[PDB]
Amino acid sequence: RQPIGLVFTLLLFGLALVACYHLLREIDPGALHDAIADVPRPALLGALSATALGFVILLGYEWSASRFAGVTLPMRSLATGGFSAFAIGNAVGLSLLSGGSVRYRLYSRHGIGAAEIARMTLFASLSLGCALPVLAALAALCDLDDAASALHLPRALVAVIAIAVLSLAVGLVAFLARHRLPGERPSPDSLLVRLGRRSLRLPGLRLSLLQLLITALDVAAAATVLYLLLPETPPFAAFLLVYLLALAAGVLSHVPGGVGVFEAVLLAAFAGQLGAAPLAAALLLYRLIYVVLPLLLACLLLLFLEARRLWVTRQAIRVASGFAAPILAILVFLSGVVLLFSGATPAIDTRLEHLGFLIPHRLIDASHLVASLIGVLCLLLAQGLRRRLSAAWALTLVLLLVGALLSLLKGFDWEEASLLSLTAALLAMFRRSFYRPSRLMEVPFSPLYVGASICVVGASVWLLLFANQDVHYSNQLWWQFALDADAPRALRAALGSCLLLLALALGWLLRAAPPAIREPNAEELQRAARIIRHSDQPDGGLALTGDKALLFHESDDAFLMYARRGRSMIALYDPIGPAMQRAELIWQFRDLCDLHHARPVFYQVRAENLPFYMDIGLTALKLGEEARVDLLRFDLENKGKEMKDLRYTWNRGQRDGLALEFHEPGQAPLDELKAISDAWLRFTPAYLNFFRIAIVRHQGKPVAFANLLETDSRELASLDLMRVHPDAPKLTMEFLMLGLILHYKAQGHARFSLGMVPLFQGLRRFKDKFQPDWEPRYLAVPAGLDPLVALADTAALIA
Amino acid sequence: RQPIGLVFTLLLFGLALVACYHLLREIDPGALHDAIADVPRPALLGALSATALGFVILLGYEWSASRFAGVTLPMRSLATGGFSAFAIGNAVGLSLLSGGSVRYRLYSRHGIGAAEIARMTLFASLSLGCALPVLAALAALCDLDDAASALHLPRALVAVIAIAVLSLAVGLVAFLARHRLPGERPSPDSLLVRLGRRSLRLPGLRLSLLQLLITALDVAAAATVLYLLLPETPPFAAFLLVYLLALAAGVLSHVPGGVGVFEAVLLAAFAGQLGAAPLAAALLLYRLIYVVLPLLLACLLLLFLEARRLWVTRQAIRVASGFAAPILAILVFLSGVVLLFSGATPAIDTRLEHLGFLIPHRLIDASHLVASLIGVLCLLLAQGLRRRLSAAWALTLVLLLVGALLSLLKGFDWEEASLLSLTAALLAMFRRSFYRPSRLMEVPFSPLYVGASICVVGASVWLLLFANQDVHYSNQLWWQFALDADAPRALRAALGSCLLLLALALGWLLRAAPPAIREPNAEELQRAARIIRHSDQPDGGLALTGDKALLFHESDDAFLMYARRGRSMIALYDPIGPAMQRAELIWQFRDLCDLHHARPVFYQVRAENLPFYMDIGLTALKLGEEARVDLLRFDLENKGKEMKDLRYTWNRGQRDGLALEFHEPGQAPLDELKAISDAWLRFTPAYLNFFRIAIVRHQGKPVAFANLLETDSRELASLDLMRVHPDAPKLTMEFLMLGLILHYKAQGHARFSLGMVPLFQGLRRFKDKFQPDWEPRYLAVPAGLDPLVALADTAALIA
Ligand SMILES: CCCCCCCCCCCCCCCCCC(=O)O[C@@H](COC(=O)CCCCCCCCCCCCCCC)COP(=O)(O)OC[C@H](O)CO
Ligand SMILES: CCCCCCCCCCCCCCCCCC(=O)O[C@@H](COC(=O)CCCCCCCCCCCCCCC)COP(=O)(O)OC[C@H](O)CO
Ligand SMILES: CCCCCCCCCCCCCCCCCC(=O)O[C@@H](COC(=O)CCCCCCCCCCCCCCC)COP(=O)(O)OC[C@H](O)CO
Ligand SMILES: CCCCCCCCCCCCCCCCCC(=O)O[C@@H](COC(=O)CCCCCCCCCCCCCCC)COP(=O)(O)OC[C@H](O)CO
């Protein structure tokens, strides 16, 4: 899907550029500049105002999603999440940080579930998508003659299509209303409908209406931004209709911003009626005001909140996995786009005139080329930053400063230099955000990032051809080094960019194959055992089975056991070591999974590392609850119903003649354990002789055994393998672990772990007999929240 | 001394500037520029060649010092140390990194003693100083008429003075040769002479001659650099004589480079004969070629070797305390000098012409002023860098980039911008060098750094008056903001620099008084005890006496006990904690001592932290040797004479009826210990109840006791207080500690410490009875290696 989807995305973008070139044949870059200058200042204020209104409506859009999801959030939190997610989501789309990814980060702080947020994201997306046909139909149905003239279709055709769409919408609403199950309601404003296979959660009448009203105002507001920037305008009904179709085409095309496809359609519709230059100027200004501007504001806002959190919560925040790294990857990517577009466009004659006296003329040429190559590097380094490489931070920050310098030496492009400098100043402030000391050469290949780069380089060549259309091409142009010669500087830059991008991409893709997964050897198992001993986490013991691969840190003070099953790679627990070692290992695991084209899964993780799993792009699903008794507050002279039942079980066990014995590793009765294991029925001598075995006996004869996970420290201890005979008494097993607890209390252990119960009722009650302290265990899995998949699933179930 | 010495240094510099202004009254900056352009290219090559020769001679200068000191070093090491020490030493003098400080750092790697290096430094300095009169006298004695005409003195006078100097030199040589003690010789090429009070170590005849020959060639070579840059020249004899006197005056004046005083004298001598412009051009070029150039090369060389060491030895080097921080403080200081001098000088008319079209004219004025203020900040921040503040690194690196930018916006000063950028590029590479996270606001006041800044600002105002002498001053000049107006830009900058420097210096000096030293409270003692437990070093126990101040780290994972005695502050051991915590604490201690105007002394330090003591500017003196027995190789079934004597002592002790008992803290027989303490004669119950006491008894009655320093780990354990009765057997004490060793071997301790012997023979033998492993303990003390002090001491002893 990914490769095909990316290829058909690039083709659509490419075709759209070709379309836009042909539609702007009769216009020169002069006419465009005049058209941009022409639009009056009241109109720009009108646009900016309409933009502000149009983004206020999206906050109410976010509110409706919270009501649907049944999520209570503060107003300031919904505001920030609403703005940032819609601002970034609309701009970059899927390429970099998406709407869902923003929502999840933001709304995980307040303890909103991963399921809830996913349900908020889907509602936010689908509601526009499914309203767009209805809104379009209604728009066309007012003044059909104008709508017909705009689309250049028969009046009868567009009439029946509009009617058909409305009728189908009504028919659908009536159908899903038919299967409305009464009684139960997930949230105040929701329904649960049944179709046979799956239950489906839909909004209520009141919420459906409100959402449609919000969607209506939002579209109108957005279209209004473009309507005000047009000197001469068509009837609004037809204009709105076209805008909605163009918007649809942009969405379906899966082009990040909707760029190219949106413009192409608008241009196509109103090529002749309005004129190219006014429309092309309006479309450009529309993009800047409604798309780019709120993105920058959102980016800044999120950086501001990150910076603030670092200032106030200095102690709490340690490793730093927040918003800075994604956001700064965007800004650095945009910085590369600026450099590349600046190069394609010719310089101002006045600046070159004077700068010719300050600089050698042949250095202007050198500066111009180098700036364009730095531009390409900026596009690719955006990935490195996203993965929190410190090498990527240092290298970027150098290139941005050099790129800002060569921007001034090029054609005194002080606007390009100012943006690049400002990006550098931001990237500098967040040095600690990029903490990984991995090589840049070992970053896994990302088709998306390469695809995005190719699009930008494509767009720049489109801009080269447009901006330098006054000159007659020739074979000699490439070798002209003059000052007035602007077109040769474009050409040479364009070629340089394309060749570098090609070279790097080939150098990236044609790389040595990654080593195959192998079970650990004796040395590694011994080294793992060492780490487990000099650590807190005893659950690490399962590593020493030697049936699952071990991934070691560079310092070799931490590891992370995992195993490949099907098309996924499941880690068994959190990494084993300090917080920083944990963070580097989690990123190492993501890297390893990306090199093997496998889905990174984490099994049974604690809540403390959830932000790091968020960072690499996983969602915490509530797997089960792990119970662990506290030995500090546990005492055998206390009172309680369950406590009295336990003391009864204990004393009855002692009177019966049950005895408990502890054997250190090496001196275990292997013959007995084997016989017991066989009677019950991994169990290997190598695995067993790593741990201390507690054997309970009934009148001398061994009645059960249990190996004990334990570290050199006394913070925690657990039990993995534990088997009892069928013929053994029922209270013997309960006596055993009670004896274990007593022994650990004598040794002076802080805590003791029993185990995890998923979602079992008998096991849950049995654990609850000891009155333990519960703690949630999570499962981390990738965020598969594609709107199209969900809509296709809905449509399939309905049909 | 320091305040008086610094004041009389500044006055001499000031007076010298006034002198140089008056001597260059009849010359305009135009005539100087022409004179600088006039000197031919063969002459410059002649100068550069003479410089290269003149610095090759200084390597042989270094060699002679090694022979005198009796130091064997590799040729490459002597070369580097020779070059770097003489290059930096001659340039910056005493202000920043000095010759001795360079030598000590460089020659500490090869395990050369602190005493030896000090003796190498003194010889390197004094040999020139004491040869300079002789060389001068001899020079004058060739062609007395020319020498008389140069000095404008009578021929008879200069004759008798020269004779008197030579006669006195011969008389001195004969006198010290008289008291030449035969037999003993510290080194092959040295003598030991006696005058009654102190023994004095002098070079041999052969070494004295060779040193004088080396000194002769060196001076000649240096003078030759200046001689070739003169179009029209006087007789060389007289020229050399003057050069030597000017050099003397420069040295005596204690002006860092000899700048001002040297030029003043040369100018004074050959004002009329040669002409101002040729001489003033030659003096400037001489400074650049012979002084500034080798400094930069030395700086680069030392940075290169640091960078290489970081690349190859990544694992070994951890905290980074080498050459980068001093060297980069110099380069950043020079960068501030460049900014300040650039501002004082008027801009090129051609550049302003064109840059006027690219920039707003009023921004040129703003850029010009801001650049000069950044210049002043660069001078002061040089200190912060020296003390390895990370805040200072970040702030500098920002100001250098802004300063390099405003250099281009000022008058397109691309030379200033290029230097500043290159400094930034270096400073960036060594980010990890500045590792301390202390506040910039808490840096102690340094009169020297403030004095240096005032000199630079003084020099800039001298340059302002010289460079802008064509304009007529008026009260209105200050308020003129034009493009052609260069002199007002100088004035406004000059005033701004002076006011900022004044303001900061006053804000620095008038600061709150530092809190007084107080003994620790119960909480601190308890917190110290905690640290000691969770650590390796048991010698930290002496902190819990509570009679000495405790300095805690910000993390509170490490501390450093110290006490004030007289005018010094003695730390008792190395800091207690990790390597990074140790390095931050040592710097904290330096800071604390500088705020209280006290000499930082470290008592009984290990060899592992010697580089960090080097960093803050202390010299390791061999205090004593600490013996510590290794329990891994120690066994009671081994063979050996001393081992058999120990086993005899043990078994005889057991047969006699000596018994050893171990009491945990709290359950000590206080009544007994008190009685034993009184019988022997800090001893307080609070101090005693922190440690485990081992009490040996003779037939039941307690015969001795000894508290045991110990941590939670088993890496090391010691004993501090240990008293025995006069009437107790002689082998009872030896049995006691043998029992202690056996007990620690049973507990499974890695090592065990006995104690330190200074320089005692009986104690040394007693420790050697157990066949321990010796390890040197050092004393860290400031480096008081002032040539004048040593010469005054020598002169006093001779007389
Ligand atoms: C009309 C002319 C206008 C001139 C411009 C005037 C205004 C300039 C304002 C510039 C301020 C922005 C720079 C602030 C960066 C934050 C500093 C920082 O944190 O730097 C980090 C990175 O280190 C740096 O030094 C980065 C330097 C790069 C800054 C680049 C931005 C400035 C760009 C200036 C123009 C450059 C030229 C462009 C044109 C060619 C170090 O972080 P740390 O956590 O390791 O250290 C913190 C310390 O311990 C204290 O707590
Ligand atoms: C034309 C619209 C209709 C058809 C669209 C379909 C075809 C798509 C392909 C082309 C789309 C973009 C074309 C127009 C973009 C702007 C062109 C432009 O002016 O580019 C300048 C440079 O490129 C841009 O400005 C690019 C703008 C788009 C991206 C901006 C992102 C902003 C964020 C950057 C990172 C900074 C982050 C810090 C800020 C918080 C260079 O031209 P100049 O002559 O104006 O500049 C010279 C001199 O400096 C001043 O005159
Ligand atoms: C004719 C035009 C000529 C144009 C110039 C072309 C040549 C430019 C060459 C510049 C290269 C020098 C910069 C190298 C600096 C070392 C990088 C570095 O380590 O930076 C540290 C500081 O961080 C930075 O990003 C510093 C950036 C500042 C660099 C300043 C020098 C460049 C100056 C360019 C011109 C600026 C404009 C001047 C004029 C206004 C980060 O160290 P770290 O240990 O934290 O990270 C290492 C990582 O883990 C990988 O191992
Ligand atoms: C005059 C000699 C006899 C009398 C001496 C007694 C009086 C002492 C006080 C004055 C001493 C210095 C006077 C002359 C210094 C140089 C003047 C000069 O040219 O200054 C320029 C700037 O100042 C300097 O260059 C100062 C030079 C001295 C210090 C240099 C240190 C180098 C290291 C700096 C740090 C960089 C580190 C990285 C490099 C490895 C600005 O003038 P400009 O017109 O040449 O420049 C404009 C344009 O850019 C090009 O024309």
TrEMBL record, chains A, B:
<feature type="transmembrane region" description="Helical">
    <location>
        <begin position="81"/>
        <end position="99"/>
    </location>
</feature>
<feature type="transmembrane region" description="Helical">
    <location>
        <begin position="207"/>
        <end position="230"/>
    </location>
</feature>
<dbReference type="GO" id="GO:0006629">
    <property type="term" value="P:lipid metabolic process"/>
</dbReference>
<dbReference type="Pfam" id="PF09924">
    <property type="entry name" value="LPG_synthase_C"/>
</dbReference>
<feature type="transmembrane region" description="Helical">
    <location>
        <begin position="363"/>
        <end position="382"/>
    </location>
</feature>
<dbReference type="GO" id="GO:0050071">
    <property type="term" value="F:phosphatidylglycerol lysyltransferase activity"/>
</dbReference>
<feature type="transmembrane region" description="Helical">
    <location>
        <begin position="389"/>
        <end position="411"/>
    </location>
</feature>
<dbReference type="InterPro" id="IPR016181">
    <property type="entry name" value="Acyl_CoA_acyltransferase"/>
</dbReference>
<feature type="transmembrane region" description="Helical">
    <location>
        <begin position="44"/>
        <end position="61"/>
    </location>
</feature>
<feature type="transmembrane region" description="Helical">
    <location>
        <begin position="288"/>
        <end position="307"/>
    </location>
</feature>
<dbReference type="GO" id="GO:0055091">
    <property type="term" value="P:phospholipid homeostasis"/>
</dbReference>
<dbReference type="InterPro" id="IPR024320">
    <property type="entry name" value="LPG_synthase_C"/>
</dbReference>
<dbReference type="InterPro" id="IPR022791">
    <property type="entry name" value="L-PG_synthase/AglD"/>
</dbReference>
<keyword id="KW-0472">Membrane</keyword>
<keyword id="KW-1133">Transmembrane helix</keyword>
<feature type="transmembrane region" description="Helical">
    <location>
        <begin position="4"/>
        <end position="24"/>
    </location>
</feature>
<feature type="domain" description="Phosphatidylglycerol lysyltransferase C-terminal">
    <location>
        <begin position="533"/>
        <end position="780"/>
    </location>
</feature>
<keyword id="KW-1003">Cell membrane</keyword>
<keyword id="KW-0046">Antibiotic resistance</keyword>
<dbReference type="GO" id="GO:0005886">
    <property type="term" value="C:plasma membrane"/>
</dbReference>
<dbReference type="GO" id="GO:0047637">
    <property type="term" value="F:phosphatidylglycerol alanyltransferase activity"/>
</dbReference>
<comment type="similarity">
    <text>Belongs to the LPG synthase family.</text>
</comment>
<feature type="transmembrane region" description="Helical">
    <location>
        <begin position="236"/>
        <end position="255"/>
    </location>
</feature>
<dbReference type="Pfam" id="PF03706">
    <property type="entry name" value="LPG_synthase_TM"/>
</dbReference>
<feature type="transmembrane region" description="Helical">
    <location>
        <begin position="489"/>
        <end position="510"/>
    </location>
</feature>
<keyword id="KW-0812">Transmembrane</keyword>
<feature type="transmembrane region" description="Helical">
    <location>
        <begin position="447"/>
        <end position="469"/>
    </location>
</feature>
<protein>
    <recommendedName>
        <fullName>Phosphatidylglycerol lysyltransferase</fullName>
        <ecNumber>2.3.2.3</ecNumber>
    </recommendedName>
</protein>
<feature type="transmembrane region" description="Helical">
    <location>
        <begin position="153"/>
        <end position="177"/>
    </location>
</feature>
<keyword id="KW-0443">Lipid metabolism</keyword>
<feature type="transmembrane region" description="Helical">
    <location>
        <begin position="319"/>
        <end position="343"/>
    </location>
</feature>
<dbReference type="InterPro" id="IPR051211">
    <property type="entry name" value="PG_lysyltransferase"/>
</dbReference>
<dbReference type="GO" id="GO:0046677">
    <property type="term" value="P:response to antibiotic"/>
</dbReference>
<feature type="transmembrane region" description="Helical">
    <location>
        <begin position="120"/>
        <end position="141"/>
    </location>
</feature>
<keyword id="KW-0808">Transferase</keyword>
<feature type="transmembrane region" description="Helical">
    <location>
        <begin position="262"/>
        <end position="282"/>
    </location>
</feature>
